[PDB]
Design a protein around this ligand. Sequence first.
Ligand SMILES: [Mg+2]
Lengths: 337, 336
Amino acid sequence: VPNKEQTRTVLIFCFHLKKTAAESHRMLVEAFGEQVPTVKTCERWFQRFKSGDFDVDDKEHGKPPKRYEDAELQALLDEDDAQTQKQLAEQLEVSQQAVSNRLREMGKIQKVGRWVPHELNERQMERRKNTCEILLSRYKRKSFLHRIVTGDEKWIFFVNPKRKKSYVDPGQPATSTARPNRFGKKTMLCVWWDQSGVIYYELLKPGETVNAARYQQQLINLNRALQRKRPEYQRVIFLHDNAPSHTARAVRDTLETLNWEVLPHAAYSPDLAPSDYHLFASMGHALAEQRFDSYESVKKWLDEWFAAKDDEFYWRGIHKLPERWEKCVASDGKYFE
Amino acid sequence: VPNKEQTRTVLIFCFHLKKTAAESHRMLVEAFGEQVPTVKTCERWFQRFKSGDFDVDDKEHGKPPKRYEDAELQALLDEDDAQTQKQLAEQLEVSQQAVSNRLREMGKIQKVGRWVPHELNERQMERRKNTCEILLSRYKRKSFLHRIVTGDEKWIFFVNPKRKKSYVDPGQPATSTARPNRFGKKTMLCVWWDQSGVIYYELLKPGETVNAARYQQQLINLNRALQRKRPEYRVIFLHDNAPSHTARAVRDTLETLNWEVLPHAAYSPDLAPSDYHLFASMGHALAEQRFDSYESVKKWLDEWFAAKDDEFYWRGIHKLPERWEKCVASDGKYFE
DNA sequence: GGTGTACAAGTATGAAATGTCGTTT
DNA sequence: AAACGACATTTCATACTTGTACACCTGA
DNA sequence: GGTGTACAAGTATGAAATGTCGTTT
DNA sequence: AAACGACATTTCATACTTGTACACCTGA
DNA sequence: GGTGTACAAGTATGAAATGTCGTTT
DNA sequence: AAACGACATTTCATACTTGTACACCTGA
Ligand SMILES: [Mg+2]
């Protein structure tokens, strides 16, 4: 028994044993059995050989025509980066599966879009832009992160329920997890800090609130702790979000009469807020799947964490603002990647 | 020139030509060159033919021994269905990458879990098993759907943003969308329907509320409507154990109509036809939809409920049995 | 920020598959 | 000459390992 | 409850690869 | 006989097109 | 929804324009 | 009719609570 390839392999052999084309077939036939290629084929083969050849592979056959240029489909991506296969299958007068494949046939993967903080509008971006433009402007003259202190305020739900992803045979159901209670115990901690480390942190009582005075009282307690915890600082650059409670007529005056550099920070720019993006964020993660039995436990936890984190950490967080702005700007104020 | 495959093929030729090993070999050298297998080899090859073992392909040779047996790592899935590779790994003293694959090898894929309403306290489940148990029992006797009217209430924000999914070259930004303002312009539709269709529905104006008072009034308008649209009508009202629904006030407001309060277990939106099936459809339907006007909403709703094929409603109300048959056989823990 | 997966590219396993050689036929 | 009967010495789909690449999450 | 992606199977291109056959040497 | 022009006859990777299968959404 | 200022718009409360009196030419 | 001082009694410029609006977090 021979085949269709190894077969022709033999004629190469013959071709080197000088046995003439037709000559070879003669053996070839009698070699195995009549059920084999023709003479003609061997002449052709030999003909192909004489020139200096060898079947690297059969040459590409005839194939139907591409029902649609390749980039013709790439145009659409260019228009709407995120459509559905079904959608393109229509714009292309094709099936969807069809597109499934062309897509594979090109780098193309499917990614989910980032969620972003707000529909920033003209005037808002414009603000951001400059803001950084400036801060960044000064960060060049010289580093003042070295003397800047920030802090913001974010919740801490007593139950971070994690949706669990599980490994299993297809058609097999995954681990189901119980939704969170939209109205359950949650303390609203707020903290301040700077490059060298944290500074002072209060954890409100479950269901507590921050008022204009409330705020004030806090800076104060803050200060007392600051001076003691921080030598050098005995100006200091304060950076906090344009809340309504931080944009307090009183506090503006409780701050001024306290003397602190009220560092600017555009509206809706939490990606410009270290406490936000780098600090809370870190927490965010390891703040997960975690459940909190009692308020004290949370504080209990807040402490451990805050501590363990090598001084380095914070440094970075704070020492990011540069690049952060640098983006804020280059991005023309739009948020950024 | 030849190779290893083709070569072997030659000694297939030669064989059949009653040519000898040490003979085939001779040719083989004069054929291509001296850069051809060892005569020895041929001989060996020959023996393989005496048996007719026409070597179709080579044969698996040396290989390291499996570090960790197969159903071994699979036995850890049986414990915690969903661990991380880094974790299964670190329990089989083997690199992670390593795992990725043995998983890959076994017909194993990862899929994210289902979300579900609430943790059912040992007790809370008992409640459900019976509640169903019973209805299900009542159903065997008679088919009381043909007269079942239910309704629950659901919000409707004016903007419903959806994280977008874009196609592009690896490492590349996907078209991003801006977060929904959690607090914002939203209405609060309230509707009742039955197997045959929708009967009546109010859409409480922006930042609206509901109080025993209000509901009564609703329950009532409902009736009116119900009657002028539903000839035949006893009647079975199925509605969640809200606070404004378990109020003695309305407890009477219903009694004063014969209306049959069907039974129902707390934390059980998955037996709320009005919920798991009516809204449900609507949900997709409201995707990425924007509403510039409170009326625009009322508009859509109308158009929609019109659009809905009659049968659809039926199905929703006829799922009820299967649903319970499940409800029970699951012991309360919601199903799937 | 912090993980989690899966490609890419090295490092061994180890029994073929081949080779070398002295020895039977 | 033509095989053999022993060990050497190449061979090469395996199992695993580092090394990355990179979708995505996390703060809003 | 609804829809979006991809693994199956079929199925018509259509030119390279292969056949059949009467010339040519 | 050996091989070549000439007009028929296969092949086989393609490009799509129905069928599904099934993760994951939605309702909460 | 939570918390603030800036401003429009219904109210208490204090200060001019008036009204009622009693008294003398 | 005349023209005061004294107390009422209405009027009206003006110092309080109220009640909307838009703003910035957030997103439970
Ligand atoms: Mg409800």
